[PDB]
């Protein structure tokens, strides 16, 4: 079934443990340090002049697969707005996401705005508010302020009958001027993403399969509507 929302609005919700942390930043990689027990990732994504998504996700290893399992609830959207009206271009611009430590919760947080191109040449803003907390009790790495720089390309599989999104993404960490979970990310790691969604009461689900190569910061995934 056709997703009730544009695929680009789900990219940030659909595993920053696969970002490339260069060796000189190895003491600042919270996402890998939480593994294998993992972390909870919570967001509110507020679309300017429109509704909002609230998301809660569990990111962790299950056997040798890195899994990202999400519940998403969207409310107060306009049925003829850019999101429920499917008015967004099928692409996804570069971001620099500033990560800061959340010492009281033993985690990290981030606030950033995604710019979605609209088909008429305007832009739809999506304000992200993000909080990440480790699931385990063992120690994690609390980072200095830094950022993640992203690049994403979206494509279609001509032989896929279901509504879908093919995604390729490169992410590298930068910007510090001042557990053995990281060892699980050597080489290529298979990834499963599962999302259960409800936007304005329109129910849908997404499954993604692929792999991540954290040494180079590369994600390759195909997502299908399984509604």
């Amino acid at each position: 079934g056709k997703l009730p929302v544009p695929w680009p609005t789900l990219v940030t919700t659909l595993v920053q443990c696969f970002s490339r942390y260069p060796d000189h930043m190895k003491r600042h990689d919270f996402f890998k340090s939480a593994m294998p027990e993992g972390y909870v990732q919570e967001r509110t994504i507020s679309f300017k002049d429109d509704g909002k998504y609230k998301t809660r996700a569990v990111v962790k290893f299950e056997g040798d697969t890195l899994v990202n399992r999400i519940e998403l609830k969207g409310t107060d959207f306009k049925e003829d707005g850019n999101i429920l009206g499917h008015k967004l271009e099928y692409n996804f611009n570069s971001d620099n996401v500033y990560i800061t430590a959340d010492k009281q919760k033993n985690g990290i947080k981030a606030n950033f705005t995604v710019r979605h191109n609209v088909e008429d040449g305007s832009v739809q803003l999506a304000d992200h508010y993000q909080q990440n907390t480790p699931i385990g009790d063992g120690p994690v790495l609390l980072p200095d302020n830094h950022y993640l720089s992203t690049q994403t390309v979206l494509s279609k599989d001509p032989n896929e009958k279901r509504d879908h999104m093919v995604l390729l993404e490169f992410v590298t960490a930068a910007g510090i001027t001042h557990s053995q979970g990281e060892e699980l990310f050597t080489g290529v790691v298979p990834i499963l993403v599962e999302l259960d969604g409800d936007v304005n009461g329109h129910k849908f689900s997404v499954r993604g399969e692929g792999e991540g190569d954290a040494t180079i910061g590369k994600l390759t995934l195909k997502f299908i509507s399984t509604t």
Side-chain angles (χ1 to χ4, degrees), residues 87-102 105-177 179-205:
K87 303 186 198 187
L88 301 183
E89 295 185 347
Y90 190 60
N91 50 34
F92 192 91
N93 299 322
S94 64
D95 293 296
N96 295 311
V97 170
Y98 285 85
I99 307 297
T100 66
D102 193 357
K105 304 203 161 62
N106 206 28
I108 59 99
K109 63 198 188 301
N111 281 355
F112 56 101
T113 298
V114 167
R115 301 179 60 78
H116 294 295
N117 286 353
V118 188
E119 284 174 353
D120 63 1
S122 69
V123 174
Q124 168 71 65
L125 300 180
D127 297 312
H128 287 57
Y129 305 90
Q130 178 180 337
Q131 215 283 326
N132 290 57
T133 301
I135 293 173
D137 298 324
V140 295
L141 293 171
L142 295 185
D144 288 353
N145 294 346
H146 65 283
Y147 60 93
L148 304 176
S149 304
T150 73
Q151 298 174 77
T152 306
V153 54
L154 311 181
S155 56
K156 297 293 193 182
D157 176 354
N159 293 294
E160 176 56 61
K161 298 179 175 188
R162 313 273 299 160
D163 195 12
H164 71 280
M165 172 177 69
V166 181
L167 170 148
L168 160 74
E169 194 175 321
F170 274 94
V171 180
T172 302
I176 293 188
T177 68
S179 172
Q180 303 176 272
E182 75 283 353
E183 308 307 327
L184 299 173
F185 290 87
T186 310
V188 172
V189 172
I191 299 167
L192 170 68
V193 181
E194 299 189 290
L195 179 145
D196 284 305
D198 164 9
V199 172
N200 275 34
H202 305 290
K203 309 304 179 60
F204 63 97
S205 44

